[PDB]
Structure formats: C-alpha cells, structure tokens
Amino acid sequence: QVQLVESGGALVQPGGSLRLSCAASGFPVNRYSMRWYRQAPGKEREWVAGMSSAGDRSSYEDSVKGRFTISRDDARNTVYLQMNSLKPEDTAVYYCNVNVGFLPADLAWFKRNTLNKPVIMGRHTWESIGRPLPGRKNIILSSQPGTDDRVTWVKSVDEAIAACGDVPEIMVIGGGRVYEQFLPKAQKLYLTHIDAEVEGDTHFPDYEPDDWESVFSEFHDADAQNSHSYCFEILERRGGGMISLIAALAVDRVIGMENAMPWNEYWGQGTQVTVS
Ligand SMILES: NC(=O)C1=CN([C@@H]2O[C@H](COP(=O)(O)OP(=O)(O)OC[C@H]3O[C@@H](n4cnc5c(N)ncnc54)[C@H](OP(=O)(O)O)[C@@H]3O)[C@@H](O)[C@H]2O)C=CC1
Ligand SMILES: COc1cc(Cc2cnc(N)nc2N)cc(OC)c1OC
Numbered sequence: 674q675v676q677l678v679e680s681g682g683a684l685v686q687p688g689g690s691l692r693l694s695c696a697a698s699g700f701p702v703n704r705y706s707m708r709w710y711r712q713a714p715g716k717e718r719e720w721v722a723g724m725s726s727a728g729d730r731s732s733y734e735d736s737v738k739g740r741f742t743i744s745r746d747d748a749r750n751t752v753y754l755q756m757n758s759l760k761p762e763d764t765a766v767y768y769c770n771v772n773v774g775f776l777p778a779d780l781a782w783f784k785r786n787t788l789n790k791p792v793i794m795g796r797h798t799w800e801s802i803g804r805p806l807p808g809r810k811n812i813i814l815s816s817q818p819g820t821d822d823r824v825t826w827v828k829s830v831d832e833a834i835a836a837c838g839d840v841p842e843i844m845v846i847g848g849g850r851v852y853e854q855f856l857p858k859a860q861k862l863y864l865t866h867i868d869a870e871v872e873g874d875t876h877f878p879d880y881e882p883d884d885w886e887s888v889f890s891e892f893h894d895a896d897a898q899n900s901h902s903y904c905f906e907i908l909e910r911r912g913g914g915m916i917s918l919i920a921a922l923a924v925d926r927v928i929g930m931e932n933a934m935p936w937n938e939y940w941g942q943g944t945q946v947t948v949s
Contacts, residue, residue, distance in 0.1 A: 675771075677771060677941035678698075680696070684947045684949065686948075687760065687761055688758060688759065695752045695753075696750065696751050705773055708769075708770040710770055712765055740757050769941035776901060776903060776936060782865060787806070790843070791811075793851065796815040801847075805823045841915060844918075849877070859917060861917040862885065869935075874929065875930070876928060890904065923935070
C-alpha cells in the first residue's frame, strides 16, 4: 500500500558527486514533509535533510550544509538528494522517510504507564526504538547474543519474567511476536485505539472481548496536537498475576510496518553510499 524505495547509492571517490532518489508509492510527496536520514556503519541513524509539506522550507544538518540539496518532483512522486563534494564521513546507508502524522499523546501515555516498571520487548522492537528506555529495566528477548550492554538480554519467556524480579507489575511493550506469547499470561491490557486506516506487517493478537473487562476508557478527537483521534483503554482479565501488555492499535489491530508506526511515518529500504 505505502512504500518508499531509494536508489542512486554507489561507490564514489572523495570530492565526487551523487544524486539519490526516493520513489514513493501510495501517497503524494507534495502533501507531506519528506526527510532524508543516514546511518553510517555501526553508528546510530542521524537526520540529514528535510523538506516541508508545501515545498517552501528546506532544512539541513550542520555537517552537510552547503553540500547537499533536497528537492522533489511532484509529477514523478520522487524526492531527490543531490550530494556534492562527498567526504568519507558521508559514507552511510541513506534512508528516505515520510512524516504522515504525530501522536505524542500515545507516547506520554506509554511513558506514564511504564516509568519505574520493568519492560519486556522483542528484538525487533528494541531495533524500532533504537535506544534504552531510561528509568526502566529494559529486558530484550532474543535467541542470539545481545548487542548493547545497557539493557538485559534474555533467551526465553521464563527468563524475561525472572529478570523482572519481585515487582508488582511487568510491562510487555511489544512487538507482535512477543505480544502473542504474553497475552495468555496477562492480567491487564493498556491499549491505545487509533482511528487510522493503515496496512502493516505486524498485528496485535486477536483478544476475545468477553475475556476482558474495561476499567478505563477515554476518547480524544484529532486536533493540531494529535493528527488522529485516539482512545485510551485499560482492560482486566475476567478470571486471572503481574503481567500487563501495553500497545497502540490502529484499525484491525495493526501495530507496525517495517519497524515503525504507520500512523506517524514510513521508511524506505535504504541505499548504500560509499565514499572511498
Ligand atoms: N504500536 C505499538 O504499540 C507497537 C508497535 N511495534 C511494532 O511491532 C513491530 C515488531 O514486532 P515483531 O516484528 O513481532 O518483533 P518483536 O518485537 O516481537 O521481537 C521479535 C523478536 O524477539 C525475539 N523473541 C521473541 N520471542 C522470543 C523467545 N520466546 N525467545 C527468544 N527470543 C524471542 C526474537 O528475536 P531473535 O530473532 O534475535 O531471536 C524475535 O525475532 C515493529 O514494527 C514495531 O514498530 C512495537 C512495539 C509496540
Ligand atoms: C517510546 O517510543 C516508542 C515506544 C513504543 C512502544 C509502545 C508505544 N506506545 C504504546 N501505546 N505502547 C507501546 N508498547 C514503540 C515505538 O516504536 C514502535 C516507540 O518509538 C516511536
């Protein structure tokens, strides 16, 4: 449905020039602000350049100012990154990005309901967040050794729970495969229901409503602060422990698309630029 694919990456000599393009599908580039990011080898993703919805404002990161220029062709539904005077430090995977909404209310809800609790998440969700959640014991499930010694890495559901210790509540924070496993064990669901019709590749497991009793619920219209209407909800299991799940669900239980939340943004595949 919605898809971005970059091209133009190449091996290029220092001082040379390159032009990246990002072909968009499923939406018009001139309706949203488009952004370029890049991730140098074994480094964290950084923002490179962006262009506003109307095409009037172009912003650049310090290290590329005067060398890169972003532009777009409304007809070809494509964004471009002209890169000149390439430096070896420009070496990275370059990623196209579209900003289709924001929902800070859900992130405030998430923070408020997880601070001072341990959080369990799968490896893909760790990658989607990209950073430890401060003020929380982070527990990541993965069959493979960890890659970040700031968080606790575990190899099984039972170890994840044991890693939490004796706490009154454990928060399972995603993603789809992890939710499936912890749903049968959960006493409580914190849900954000988002009024967004999006396809994704990750879903919240179907929970049966008669299994669950709503103890809190609160609908908020969309406005200039949250671009989709949303409804917070807290459910308790009829006939239950300390395990809670917290998740934000768009229509039909979609929770994710390529390690991002599709009510807010979509990412491209990335194109490799090597300056050497
Ligand atoms: N809207 C929302 O509320 C949320 C949305 N999301 C979205 O969900 C998507 C990711 O969900 P998903 O793709 O399901 O991946 P998950 O985040 O559930 O993590 C999957 C990985 O976790 C590890 N894992 C899971 N169970 C076990 C186990 N029993 N023992 C060992 N390792 C285990 C494996 O890692 P390995 O392969 O290393 O063994 C597995 O591949 C992303 O798009 C993200 O944006 C994420 C969080 C919340
Ligand atoms: C703190 O930032 C993120 C948090 C989450 C997890 C999460 C986010 N919102 C809700 N309601 N439940 C969750 N389990 C997921 C994210 O990406 C999928 C985040 O980055 C945007």
